[PDB]
From a paper:
Aggrecan ([name]) is a large, secreted chondroitin sulfate proteoglycan that includes three globular regions named G1, G2, G3, and is decorated with multiple glycosaminoglycan attachments between its G2 and G3 domains. The N-terminal G1 region interacts with the glycosaminoglycan hyaluronan (HA), which is an essential component of the vertebrate extracellular matrix. [name] is a large, secreted glycoprotein that spans more than 2500 amino acids in humans. Its N-terminus includes a globular region named G1 that shares ∼39% amino acid identity with HAPLN1 and is composed of an immunoglobulin (Ig) domain and two Link modules. We demonstrate that the single immunoglobulin domain and the two Link modules that comprise the G1 region form a single structural unit, and that HA is clamped inside a groove that spans the length of the tandem Link domains.
Thus, the G1 domain of [name] was crystallized in the presence of a fivefold molar excess of a HA decasaccharide (HA10) to obtain atomic level information between [name] and HA. The crystal structure of the [name](G1)-HA10 complex was solved by molecular replacement and refined to 2.59 Å (Rwork/Rfree = 0.194/0.238). There are two molecules of [name] in the asymmetric unit that superimpose with an RMSD of 0.18 Å over 301 shared Cα positions. The electron density for the bound HA10 is well-defined for all the sugar residues in the oligosaccharide. The oligosaccharide buries 820 Å2 of surface area and fits within a groove that spans both Link domains in [name], while the Ig domain does not make any contact with HA. Comparison of the bound and free form of [name] indicates that the segment comprising residues 217 to 241 that was disordered in HA-free [name] is now ordered and makes substantial contact with the oligosaccharide. Concomitantly, HA10 adopts an almost linear conformation that differs from the structure of free HA obtained from powdered diffraction. However, a loop extends from Link-2 to bind to HA between the two Link domains, giving the appearance that the oligosaccharide is pinched at the interface between Link-1 and Link-2. Overall, the 10 monosaccharide residues in the crystallized HA oligosaccharide contact 18 amino acids in [name] through van der Waals or hydrogen bonding interactions. Surprisingly, there are only two salt bridge interactions between HA and [name] residues in spite of the five negative charges found in HA. These interactions involve the guanidinium groups of R217 and R326, which contact the carboxylate groups of GlucA4 and GlucA6 at the center of the bound decasaccharide.
Residue numbers in the entry: 30 to 54, 70 to 350
């Protein structure tokens, strides 16, 4: 008689802490998560002891077990996008066993943003407006830490909502060592004066509409792309909306204009000729050091948003 007294699905933000109450009426508690075609066992508990999946140590626990033997409440800390899925609370008592499920959707995505004024040109105030102009708000360290645990690697320092300047690193290297040297993790410069200029990390929570490509035989200049999205009853998508679209699996091997006068394209399948065997939002720059948005007269597709 296992029950989870919560409506499904449950939608929570990236970087927060989750609590799934599970009650039931010597028993063996087993928590699992079903995401795509895979299933992961989070923890197993019996006789007052909790064995936790090695990769989820300190992240998941039973805060009320075994102090209350019939309370299998699960707590998940530092919610990532890969912590989304169908959570199963399973209890066994001898040959008997029942279960309850709850689908959890972790909303949001963190992305690095280099502005049209180019590298390290955003002070704390302009770092905040760049996110607002891209369907997002400046990210918190908790959100950046969660994105790093999802594999985010970016060797560009950027402002954060707590007036710190950080960047996440998985593969330490000359130029990306920071304060942490060869150990992986999110580097930090500490709290910085607001007049200092860096990039920024933005957190896009959600979007109501859909992102789609609009093209033509001879492509579009930036202003022609803006008119084409308008003609179709839409508008140019922002960088934040493209990242959310990519997160939902959008793939298009063609660069296109965005509302911030940038040129990007999403890649969800790693091919050599499309994205260079990399996944994510690829940005086209003028100079090889990833500086300078393309000239507005350059011809690209239009990335629209309903
Ligand atoms: C105050 C005080 O004092 N403070 C303190 C501190 O101190 C500090 O510290 C700091 C630290 O931090 O440490 C420092 O800083 C530093 O400093 C130094 C000195 O000065 C510096 O240096 C640094 O900086 C850095 O550096 C670095 C280096 O350099 O290294 C850098 O790095 C970078 O990073 C980044 C980020 O992560 C990255 O990204 C990079 O990398 C790169 O990248 C690039 C890019 O991205 O771009 C790349 O490239 C690329 O790649 C890709 C991939 O692979 C590719 O893809 C590409 O290519 C392309 O591709 C494409 C595709 O898509 O694929 C193509 O296209 C195509 O094509 C094809 C053929 O044609 C076609 O097919 C297609 O299409 C298709 O088809 C077609 C036909 O066919 O027809 C058509 C249609 O269309 C379709 O269908 C196409 N596609 C399309 C779509 O269209 C193309 O072609 C190609 O091109 C690529 N690109 C290229 C251009 O190539 C690469 O790879 C890579 O590499 C990196 N880099 C490198 C070099 O590596 C960074 O960034 C930076 O940052 C600094 N740092 C920082 C962070 O800042 C300072 O100094 C001091 O003061 C301390 O520390 C502490 C403790 O003690 O404390 C405090 O308080
Ligand atoms: C997190 O989920 C994204 C979704 O595409 C996936 O690409 C990435 O590999 C996942 N990371 C981890 C560490 O599971
Ligand atoms: C910010 O202001 C301080 C104090 O006025 C000044 O010394 C410093 O050069 C400025 N920083 C930058 C990055 O311009
Ligand atoms: C990037 O390369 C271009 C072209 O050589 C150069 O003008 C520029 O100074 C370089 N660095 C930065 C930080 O823009």
């Amino acid at each position: 008689s296992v029950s989870i007294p919560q409506p499904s699905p449950l939608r929570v933000l990236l970087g927060t802490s989750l609590t799934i109450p599970c009650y039931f009426i010597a028993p063996r508690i087993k928590w699992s998560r079903v995401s795509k075609e895979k299933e992961v066992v989070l923890l197993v508990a019996t006789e007052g002891r909790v064995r936790v999946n090695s990769a989820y140590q300190d992240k998941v626990s039973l805060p009320n077990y075994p102090a209350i033997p019939s309370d299998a409440t699960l707590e998940v800390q530092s919610l990532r996008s890969n912590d989304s899925g169908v959570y199963r609370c399973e209890v066994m008592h001898g040959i008997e066993d029942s279960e309850a499920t709850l689908e959890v959707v972790v909303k949001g995505i963190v992305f690095h943003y280099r502005a049209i004024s180019t590298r390290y040109t955003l002070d704390f105030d302009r770092a905040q407006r760049a996110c607002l102009q891209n369907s997002a708000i400046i990210a918190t360290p908790e959100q950046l830490q969660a994105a790093y645990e999802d594999g985010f690697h970016q060797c560009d320092a950027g402002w954060l909502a707590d007036q710190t300047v950080r960047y996440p690193i998985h593969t330490p290297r000359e130029g990306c060592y920071g304060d942490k040297d060869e150990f992986p993790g999110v580097r930090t410069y500490g709290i910085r004066d607001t007049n200092e200029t860096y990039d920024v990390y933005c957190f896009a929570e959600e979007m109501e509409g859909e992102v789609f490509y609009a093209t033509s035989p001879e492509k579009f200049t930036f202003q022609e792309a803006a008119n084409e999205c308008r003609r179709l009853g839409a508008r140019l998508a922002t960088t934040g909306q493209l990242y959310l679209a990519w997160q939902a699996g959008m793939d298009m091997c063609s660069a296109g204009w965005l509302a911030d006068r940038s040129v990007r394209y999403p890649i969800s399948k790693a091919r050599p000729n499309c994205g260079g065997n990399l996944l994510g939002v690829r940005t086209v720059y003028v100079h090889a050091n990833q500086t300078g948005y393309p000239d507005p007269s350059s011809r690209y597709d239009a990335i629209c948003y309903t």
